[PDB]
Amino acid sequence: RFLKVKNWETDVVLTDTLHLKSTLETGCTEHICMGSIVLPTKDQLFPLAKEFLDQYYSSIKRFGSKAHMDRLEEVNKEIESTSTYQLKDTELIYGAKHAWRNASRCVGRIQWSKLQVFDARDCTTAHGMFNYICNHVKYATNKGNLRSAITIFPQRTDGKHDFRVWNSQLIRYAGYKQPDGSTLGDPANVQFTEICIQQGWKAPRGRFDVLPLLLQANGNDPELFQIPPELVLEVPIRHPKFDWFKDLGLKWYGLPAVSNMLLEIGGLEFSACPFSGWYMGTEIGVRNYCDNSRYNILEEVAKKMDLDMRKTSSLWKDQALVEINIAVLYSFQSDKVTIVDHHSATESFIKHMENEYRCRGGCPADWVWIVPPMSGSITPVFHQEMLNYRLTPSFEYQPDPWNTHVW
């Protein structure tokens, strides 16, 4: 019931009580751990609402007060006659911040309380969505000095009137299959790119073409919009020691903005809720650039470095990997675009865990995601035991909408 986590580098031991307030299911059983698997009515709504409002009033130190009780009553009245309810602005802001706070896969949660919430619940059209998104992009980007934000569109109703952003991130590059047999641009985005072209996008057929947005409002068929190019801050990638690096032709965008998730607050479901913070360097340099199924540039870089690629045991992949990541961090810094390195981010996260343990009785955390994809054990999170459990409010994965939507 009371659980301990040990840090094996420092011997520090923390006691987790927060997991008892856990609700959703992990996918693990007593017989089998699924820790590494990427994806493991009116009567339903009111307990969810109550649970949420209870934690809200408790957080503003007004638990069991006459405003608490009054609010529980009002919401129940609204559910009874309307079959849903509307959040107060204060509750929406709290819900959003807590969904980030509870994101067990997110290393960057030391920041969770600083989130700027943009209430777009008055939005009715795809055009409205595009406006709100450009405003999000410009506010968050802040000429390179990034600020975390989320923009929240209307909640699911009967689920036939869903707001969805079809893109997985507000800003991503296109991917194209070629007669050549290989892939140009980002192979992750090949399918989406074709859906764009099929909806009518004029693709420039380049390696780094910022995708158009495909916005769906009120359950209607989605529409295409190009983000104003001057709102998309991008960084050319150079190395502080290697002159030739720049000639690889590499760039990345400054704003990571996840747009395919579902925000659940008080049992209410926000299917379009793009949020953004800023990059940890490894996301770009390790995953985006070096994953086999991504830009996959390791082979080319090692070649420019004249390393011995005859034997895996020369660690040429590893040498090149480091240099790629040095260049990402360098390029972002030189251009004054907020980025954080994996040492600095994981250290801040240990500080955040300790804060959450003393202040909240725990911090749900998924070690498989929290440990950076390079140099794992030289960052402190590697040595830190973590307990993973699902708290609400939460962000949840949701399936790509093209498998769901009917035209």
Ligand X SMILES: Cc1cc(N)nc(C[C@@H]2CNC[C@@H]2NCCNCCc2cccc(F)c2)c1
Ligand Y SMILES: C[C@H](O)[C@H](O)[C@H]1CNc2nc(N)[nH]c(=O)c2N1
Of Zn ion, ligand HEM, ligand Y, none, which one does residue 28 interact with (CB within 5 to 8 Å by kind)? Answer: Zn ion
* In the complex, least distance from residue 330 CB atom to ligand Y, rounded to whole angstroms: 22
User: Residue 336, by phi and psi: left (phi above 0), alpha (psi -120 to 50) or beta?
Assistant: left
SS3 for 150? strand
Task: Say which amino acid occupies 360.
Answer: R
> Is 363 an annotated catalytic residue?
no
Which stretch of DSSP H or E encloses residue 197?
helix 190-199
Q: Kindly give the pairing relationship between strand 339-340 and strand 279-280.
A: parallel
321 is an interface residue for a second copy by CB under 8 A:
yes
**From the list 8, 13, 114, 159, which residue makes contact with ligand Y (rule: CB under 6 A)?**
8
Strand partners, 2: none
Stretch that binds ligand HEM, among 108-116, 137-145, 203-211, 289-297 (CB under 6 A): 108-116
Per-residue binding letters, 263-302, with a second copy (x by CB under 8 A): ------------------x----xx--xxxx----x----
Of Zn ion, ligand Y, ligand HEM, none, which one does residue 223 interact with (CB within 5 to 8 Å by kind)? Answer: none
254 is an interface residue for ligand X by CB under 6 A:
no
144-158 b/e (C-beta count within 10 Å ≥ 16 → b): bebbbbbbbbbbbee
- Please provide the DSSP assignment of 278-312 as one string: -EEHHIIIIIIHHSTTTT--HHHHHHHTT---S-G
Distance of CA 143 to the CA centre of its chain: 21
In the bound state with ligand X, the residue whose beta carbon lies nearer, of 185 and 316, is 185
Please tell me the count of residues contacting ligand HEM according to CB under 6 A. 21
111 is an interface residue for ligand HEM by CB under 6 A:
yes
In the bound state with ligand HEM, the residue whose beta carbon lies nearer, of 245 and 362, is 362
Q: Which of residues 326-355 bind ligand HEM (CB under 6 A)?
A: 340, 345
329 is an interface residue for a second copy by CB under 8 A:
yes
Neighbours of 119 (CB within 10 A): 16
Q: Which residues are annotated as a binding site?
A: 36, 106, 169, 278-279, 283, 368-369, 382, 397
